[PDB]
Amino acid sequence: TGYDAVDDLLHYHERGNGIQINGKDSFSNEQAGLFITRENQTWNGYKVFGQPVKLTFSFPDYKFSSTNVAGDTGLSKFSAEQQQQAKLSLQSWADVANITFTEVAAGQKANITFGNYSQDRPGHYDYGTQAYAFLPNTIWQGQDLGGQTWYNVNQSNVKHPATEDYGRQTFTHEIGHALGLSHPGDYNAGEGDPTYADVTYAEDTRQFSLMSYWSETNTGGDNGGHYAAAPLLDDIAAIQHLYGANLSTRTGDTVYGFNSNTGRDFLSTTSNSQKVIFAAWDAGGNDTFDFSGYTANQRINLNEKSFSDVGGLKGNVSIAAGVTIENAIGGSGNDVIVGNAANNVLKGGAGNDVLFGGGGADELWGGAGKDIFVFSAASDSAPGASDWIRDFQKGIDKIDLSFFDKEANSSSFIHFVDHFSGTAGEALLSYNASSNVTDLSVNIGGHAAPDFLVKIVGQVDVATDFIV
Ligand SMILES: [Ca+2]
Ligand SMILES: [Ca+2]
Ligand SMILES: [Ca+2]
Ligand SMILES: [Ca+2]
Ligand SMILES: [Ca+2]
Ligand SMILES: [Ca+2]
Ligand SMILES: [Ca+2]
Ligand SMILES: [Zn+2]
């Protein structure tokens, strides 16, 4: 049934509350954020949390023959392409927490610096390392190393971050360290051989945090060979814990995905081939997840902290804690679209879709195809805040009320009548041929009056259009 599909999406990636996944403990979004910042170091001071911060950054002109604090040499300044991508990574962190970044001249002392290295010793090129950075307040010989980030330019992804997404992710990851974030678990490579089996909690994967090195496939995600460019779900919790949530970000009506007005590369796409991977942070307005241009079967959940399967990928889109996204538009595939307690405009597009509005007064459009509109509570469409199904086609679309009889474990609870009598479970269809509107009223609670009312544009055939 349509309800089965909804129920499935609602319990996708449940976490915390004593759950154990992969033989590992499951941490909630909150716990993961705290664990990722377990070093307690911030630019505001040790254990000083929730305060804004203003930081400077620059691209120093390093001398090739110079040796850095780590012992690496064959140094160089960031190229134009590298600088451009580093600035995009910085902004992605500034979008979510109260952090202000300001670029200073190559000579001026800056809090965060970017530099390339190519040799582990003079005259010897290093093809084995990727990058590293120092957390704030890292003191060495009376000097703070905090804010320094270094990258192995012999790696093509580091040299070409604009075309190699792992390079862009690396910039975001190292800057994360420079801001106070650690990897989600303790494990040393090089002089150690860690694997996902060495994680502290199940959600330590690239599906939840880009501070992680473990594949998203470990938790059931699948990014189709791509890498997230910006802070993921648990990274947002981590960074906002340190510097507070940015309440000024995208406060207007924002569109994510296709036809985006975000002005962010990782939140926008112009074709079915260009895949999105992101955790959405949005501080206000009436917002829309527009995934209309994708052909794959998608699963879109508008609940906060929940995961969606978008554009042919799995668990690649999520919504941060405290964010309310209002609308969703599916693509040409057979989609499952689950709304939240707010008023939502849900559009299935072509294909056979399953739409679930949840609470609030929702506006549901099945579009072309055999669509199913699902309900599981009187509050889903309360009289006075009724849902509207705007394009119902009798004999083609369906209204799924199967939840009620299943819960009641009775085939006679929900049953259609031609007139009410106060009995619980009575359902009544009222068709107005002049206005082309059908009222579906149900007395679920067994009150004097119906406690559930859906308004439908179009005729409904009781003999063929319901799943009970
Ligand atoms: Ca917005
Ligand atoms: Ca909103
Ligand atoms: Ca669709
Ligand atoms: Ca459809
Ligand atoms: Ca809703
Ligand atoms: Ca339809
Ligand atoms: Ca509703
Ligand atoms: Zn790292």
Side-chain angles (χ1 to χ4, degrees), residues 15-107 110-345:
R15 53 198 298 208
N17 286 45
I19 287 174
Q20 177 131 151
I21 300 163
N22 294 300
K24 252 81 182 60
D25 290 319
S26 169
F27 280 11
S28 62
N29 173 227
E30 294 63 45
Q31 302 174 259
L34 294 177
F35 200 74
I36 289 171
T37 54
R38 68 189 174 290
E39 291 300 311
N40 301 314
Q41 296 297 350
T42 80
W43 280 96
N44 283 325
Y46 179 69
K47 284 190 170 185
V48 173
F49 304 129
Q51 307 298 321
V53 72
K54 291 182 183 173
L55 297 168
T56 59
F57 69 93
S58 64
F59 301 97
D61 202 338
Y62 296 106
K63 294 74 168 172
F64 195 82
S65 38
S66 299
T67 303
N68 69 16
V69 297
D72 294 313
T73 182
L75 312 186
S76 60
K77 178 194 177 69
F78 258 26
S79 73
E81 173 180 358
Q82 286 181 304
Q83 292 179 34
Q84 163 211 98
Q85 295 290 307
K87 285 177 182 138
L88 294 184
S89 288
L90 286 161
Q91 178 176 67
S92 72
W93 282 112
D95 273 1
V96 310
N98 296 129
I99 308 167
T100 297
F101 290 115
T102 303
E103 188 183 0
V104 300
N111 296 116
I112 296 181
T113 53
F114 297 86
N116 292 304
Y117 68 89
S118 58
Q119 301 178 340
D120 54 355
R121 52 187 166 78
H124 185 260
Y125 288 87
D126 172 18
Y127 296 101
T129 59
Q130 173 71 6
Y132 54 87
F134 303 97
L135 267 70
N137 316 318
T138 294
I139 310 298
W140 193 230
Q141 353 283 62
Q143 311 145 334
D144 186 20
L145 307 186
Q148 269 183 50
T149 71
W150 291 100
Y151 313 81
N152 191 339
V153 76
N154 293 320
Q155 309 297 352
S156 59
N157 72 88
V158 165
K159 193 185 181 188
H160 295 298
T163 45
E164 312 212 6
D165 63 3
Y166 189 59
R168 171 73 173 277
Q169 178 172 109
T170 291
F171 287 5
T172 308
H173 175 112
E174 297 309 329
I175 292 169
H177 285 315
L179 293 171
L181 308 196
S182 297
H183 296 135
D186 294 308
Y187 33 55
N188 161 89
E191 294 320 293
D193 200 48
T195 64
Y196 172 75
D198 307 323
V199 301
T200 298
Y201 65 103
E203 299 81 11
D204 180 357
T205 73
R206 282 177 167 131
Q207 171 163 44
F208 295 85
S209 170
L210 47 60
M211 291 315 299
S212 178
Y213 285 122
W214 313 132
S215 175
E216 70 275 5
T217 61
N218 285 293
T219 38
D222 184 346
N223 292 337
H226 303 112
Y227 294 93
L232 296 169
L233 193 60
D234 297 349
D235 297 318
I236 291 169
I239 201 68
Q240 290 182 341
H241 170 238
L242 303 186
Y243 306 108
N246 190 344
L247 306 177
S248 62
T249 302
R250 293 179 287 272
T251 52
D253 295 351
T254 324
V255 181
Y256 294 83
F258 288 87
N259 309 298
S260 186
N261 63 348
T262 59
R264 294 295 181 274
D265 64 337
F266 56 87
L267 298 175
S268 316
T269 175
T270 55
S271 65
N272 184 51
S273 289
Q274 184 184 2
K275 309 300 179 183
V276 294
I277 302 165
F278 66 76
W281 171 253
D282 187 294
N286 292 307
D287 312 303
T288 305
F289 268 6
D290 187 341
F291 300 136
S292 62
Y294 287 131
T295 59
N297 293 344
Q298 310 182 89
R299 298 205 301 166
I300 309 163
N301 188 346
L302 297 186
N303 284 283
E304 70 171 72
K305 290 181 294 185
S306 77
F307 284 87
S308 295
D309 297 331
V310 169
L313 275 51
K314 289 176 193 164
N316 56 306
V317 162
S318 54
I319 298 169
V323 175
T324 303
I325 299 298
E326 292 71 18
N327 316 308
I329 306 167
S332 49
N334 305 331
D335 314 314
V336 177
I337 306 171
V338 170
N340 51 41
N343 291 358
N344 313 121
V345 175

Side-chain angles (χ1 to χ4, degrees), residues 388-419:
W388 270 94
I389 297 175
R390 302 277 182 198
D391 62 356
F392 194 88
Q393 277 302 308
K394 75 158 190 187
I396 298 164
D397 300 309
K398 274 158 165 42
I399 288 166
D400 185 339
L401 300 170
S402 69
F403 176 82
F404 305 103
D405 282 3
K406 184 197 187 85
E407 178 173 68
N409 261 355
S410 170
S411 291
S412 307
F413 177 50
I414 294 292
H415 61 290
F416 292 87
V417 296
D418 63 280
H419 77 278

